Amino acid sequence: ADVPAGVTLAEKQTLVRNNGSEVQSLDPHKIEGVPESNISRDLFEGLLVSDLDGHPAPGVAESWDNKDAKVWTFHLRKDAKWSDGTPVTAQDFVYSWQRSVDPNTASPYASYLQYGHIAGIDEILEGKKPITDLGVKAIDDHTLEVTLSEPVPYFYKLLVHPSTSPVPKAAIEKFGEKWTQPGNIVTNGAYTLKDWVVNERIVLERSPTYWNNAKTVINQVTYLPIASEVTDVNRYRSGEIDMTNNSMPIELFQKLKKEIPDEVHVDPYLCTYYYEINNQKPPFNDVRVRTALKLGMDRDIIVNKVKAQGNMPAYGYTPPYTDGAKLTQPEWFGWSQEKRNEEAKKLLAEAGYTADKPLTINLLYNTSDLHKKLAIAASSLWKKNIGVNVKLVNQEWKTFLDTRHQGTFDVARAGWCADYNEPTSFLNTMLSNSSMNTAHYKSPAFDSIMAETLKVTDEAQRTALYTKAEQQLDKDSAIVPVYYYVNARLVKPWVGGYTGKDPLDNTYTRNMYIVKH
Structure with a gap:
């Protein structure tokens, strides 16, 4: 987060957001929805992230190269770390992308890297070739080379999506589907998982091993799974929720726009x-x-x-x-x-x-x-x-x-x-x-x-x-x-860092802050 000069931060840096529903999963290869991505972007970080305007920006990769938009080389930052202290490496990405396209994973986003045409992917997705044939390799611990079967000038823009985030091999193999449980999960985003109560809340807490932790402000964010837009707004007005889901009750919008005009944000949404x-x-x-x-x-x-x-x-x-x-x-x-x-x-x-x-x-x-x-x-x-x-x-x-x-x-x-x-x-x-x-x-x-x-x-x-x-x-x-x-939602006046200028609405909790109120 980039907190402006003059702003006085609140002592309690905590945020409550409605996520709209109970997530499918916290496994980045088992998700396909907005709610799932919202949480995933706080827990796991890929090669690139979206800046505040929606443009791709450095994530784990601090710089990158391409030849003819067909061979892409990513230089991974040396201080990228998992929540258990160990380094995030090129090898992590190789393992993760391979897992994303494995038929045994059955990812709803199995086809996502085929949108980028990584070499070998077509026959891997059909189960005719092993996942280790995928055109991604760890040249060394901090250099990931991706080889495409043809030029794809926009390939880099895919890499902000959570299905392309790294995942921890050892936790997955020890715990299978239980790897995302609070005691087991290992993460590399700005937050880790504190608590997960089905149909009640997901609580994430700031992760000091995150390479860019010095810039994080919010210490804890809670995501709620409330499907009722009307309930969402009600719990917003009574002080529990800081940011509603971007789903408004049709009948209540104009009244909100009249009563709390400065809290109603409406932005383009693709x-x-x-x-x-x-x-x-x-x-x-x-x-x-x-x-x-x-x-x-x-x-x-x-x-x-x-x-x-x-x-x-x-x-x-x-x-x-x-x-x-x-x-x-x-x-x-x-x-x-x-x-x-x-x-x-x-x-x-x-x-x-x-x-x-x-x-x-x-x-x-x-x-x-x-x-x-x-x-x-x-x-x-x-x-x-x-x-x-x-x-x-x-x-x-x-x-x-x-x-x-x-x-x-x-x-x-x-x-x-x-x-x-x-x-x-x-x-x-x-x-x-x-x-x-x-x-x-x-x-x-x-x-x-x-x-x-x-x-x-x-x-x-x-x-x-x-x-x-x-x-x-x-x-x-x-x-x-x-x-x-x-993209219409309610945001409390003391919530800072929500610009609304990304038309894909890929916000990160690490970009927000609570102004004293």
Whole structure:
């Protein structure tokens, strides 16, 4: 943290944040969600971190080199240390990345380093080649060399993601899944784990072995797992919570904005709210049925509910403000809803679903006051607009994510947030082979467009291809875009170091401080 001149720090440097739900895991290879990443960024530190503006900055690596954006060499800082005093080495990263891509690990982010095209990865992910063939090596204890199968100019931007953080071999092998328990866990971020009470709290405490501990200010941070936005705000107003989750109660926003205007932060956020269709679940294996569902949704009515927060109605997957995106709106997005509804019902009839023989589907969502209200509106809209009957099903975060990977759902509320600020962070999740493809969308044509993005010579051509990717995704009605996110949360006046200027919102507790109050 960089505390300004004049600021008087409080004696008690402690922070309470709502994390929104109970984490899947504290193992960096077993996570895929925002809540999981939030805690992971305090506990483990990779080669690079995000600075306050979201730009990649030195983490364990203090400097780095690249040849032709294909061989990357990272010089690791000599004082990088684990919480048990031992050094963080190149060898740690080799072990960790290998573990990330091992089929036996079953990481939901197994495909993340394949987004960077590390040599050997394709056949390792399929179980045809051993993990030790991965193109990552420890040249010496403090020099990590990564070899890619082709130039990837943005490869370095991936390396801030927690799935690329190092993990402690000895704790994992001694304790298996219990390695992340308070007595067993070994960490290399600014904090370590103090306490973990399921469905109550996770308490982290400052770790003096952290190389940059001298700059850390907060001594203890508590993360809470409260899924109810309304409860989050209530416990904020009564003094328990210092920072809410970035999920507002629709109905309370304007009142908050009127009563405590200086505590309401609203910033750009590179995430898209959508209804993910299970493309492998009949009848949604029919492009006509998916298209009907996409067109029949009234984005204007949904967005109008959160209007005060400034959300924009969505026409695709990749947020239009993503670095490197110059997206086009498809023709259907310029129609009236009436016209959209008429098209949708004709499509349904072509597929054989009529007024007299209507479709009933299940809409899955994760427990949340916001998603519930929006799901009730979505069901009502679909019934009235295109004659589809929609039943709601709610599941807790961890299980919700499980269900979507297992494919035991029809349609699901979903939100995806960039992991690095470049359109492949989104588009690579719809690759046929991706560990993150919960839509179960498989288009050889799409995959082929994405393979072309790394064969072109300049960034303008790459940008034009990302637009071709989105157009293909839309032509296949893989998902039902709803709205582009904003990052809206409550932050107490004495909390310092929250700038909100990173559009991916990768904040670190080590950057905050408590002003005397």
